[PDB]
């Protein structure tokens, strides 16, 4: 039974411009099986009412999802992506960087 | 094990006419002769509702409709002109999931027989 490992990217929809309203994405992909847990984080806070794309998969049978929430960046607010999956010895957190 | 008297033994009857669900794959010509060996005609498509029935029993099947050259008129077995629509070097008509299509007269496909 194949088990692949999520590939995580945390970013914003439009260039991050302090104060203005944007969007926070977390794009996990190339993982298998389908059961994955994803949370968006405001300073360690689980952001509630985060929605997510419809479960599709790519040419090699691996899955991909888009988690996302409307949000407004600041020079004091830190954001991140906590991802748990059956192939992770423990939840993997990738912090948001507006340069990547 | 009693069965209908008008129609052959393991045949099924639907609307005044008897049917034989092929389950064997054969070329249009082979089917034509087969159906004749079984003292009947190849599958003709009376109604566009007899077709919603047929499409529930079997997915695809040859039918009594063909063309000579890749362009003469589509003709029923009665030499008559066909009065339904239908989708290269293809010249025999098949029924595929409640639609009438053009196929290769040499292809092996399922065939059904039919009576009056």
């Amino acid at each position: 039974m194949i088990q692949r490992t999520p590939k995580i990217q945390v970013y914003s929809r439009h260039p991050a411009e302090n104060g203005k309203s944007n969007f926070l994405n977390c794009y996990v992909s190339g993982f298998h099986p389908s059961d994955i847990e994803v949370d968006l984080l405001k300073n360690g806070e689980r952001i509630e009412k985060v929605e997510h794309s419809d479960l599709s998969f790519s040419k090699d049978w691996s899955f991909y999802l888009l988690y996302y929430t409307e949000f407004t960046p600041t020079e004091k607010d830190e954001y991140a992506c906590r991802v748990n999956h059956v192939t992770l010895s423990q939840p993997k957190i990738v912090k948001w960087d507006r340069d990547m | 094990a009693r069965h209908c008297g008008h129609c052959p033994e393991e045949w099924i009857t639907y609307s005044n006419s008897c049917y034989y669900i092929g389950k064997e794959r054969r070329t249009w010509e082979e089917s034509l002769l087969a159906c004749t060996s079984k003292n009947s005609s190849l599958l003709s498509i009376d109604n566009e509702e007899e077709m919603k029935f047929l499409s529930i029993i079997s997915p695809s099947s040859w039918i009594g409709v063909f063309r000579n050259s890749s362009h003469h008129p589509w003709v029923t077995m009665n030499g008559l002109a066909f009065k339904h629509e239908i989708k290269a070097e293809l010249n025999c008509a098949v029924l595929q999931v409640n639609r009438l299509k053009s196929a290769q007269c040499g292809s092996s496909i399922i065939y059904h027989c039919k009576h009056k």
Partner: protein
Amino acid sequence: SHSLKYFHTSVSRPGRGEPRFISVGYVDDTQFVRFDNDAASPRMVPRAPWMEQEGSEYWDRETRSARDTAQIFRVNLRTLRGYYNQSEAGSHTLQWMHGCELGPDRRFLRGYEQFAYDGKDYLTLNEDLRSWTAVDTAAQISEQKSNDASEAEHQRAYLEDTCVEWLHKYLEKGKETLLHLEPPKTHVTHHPISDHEATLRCWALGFYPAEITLTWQQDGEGHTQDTELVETRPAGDGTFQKWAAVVVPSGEEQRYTCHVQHEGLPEPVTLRW
């Protein structure tokens, strides 16, 4: 060139009986319909603004299809758990995908279709669309029970007929968006690592379709290396984003160039900083 791709996923759940079944339909790189037998609406819904003008006639038929496919899969999962002599306790995954590609000329170019069990290739539809070929020395069973039954046909017919005709039906319905090319908003940034090295990160934003390229070269010419390239990610507004960076000995920044290749571009762009 365009495409109508569908992706079907059925995951089994030992606990709550009925396995979950999800379907998504993509034209090109735009999703328009989805089905999820585990939502508020156990039917097919639109996921694109240009589908919200279809009637019961279509939304019904497609649900008929989805729901019926899902029952076939509930069976199949069992059927397979059998072949692979599997724990009835475990949870397993059946996947199916098919699609038709139109040539530049607007007419059918090629079609594909294949099944997968637990992330592994199970059954594939031959290029010539006339027969099925097993992959696992255990899908051989499903092979000859599909070649015999001759499903190859109604399938070969979907791809060439229905699928193609419908793709066109969709491209017309969603004309304004599906067809409009959106080139990338390219631009380079500078990112010092130490006193000695700096990162040149070439961006490409808000573009569609998702195929692109991004390449670094410099003084001298082609290639360089010590490069990073990230998976083309979705923005969420239907467009995409990708970036390619490279590390550079300080001061030399203006040796390097970034070559963006996209279909939305007249011809390849080049950036410097």
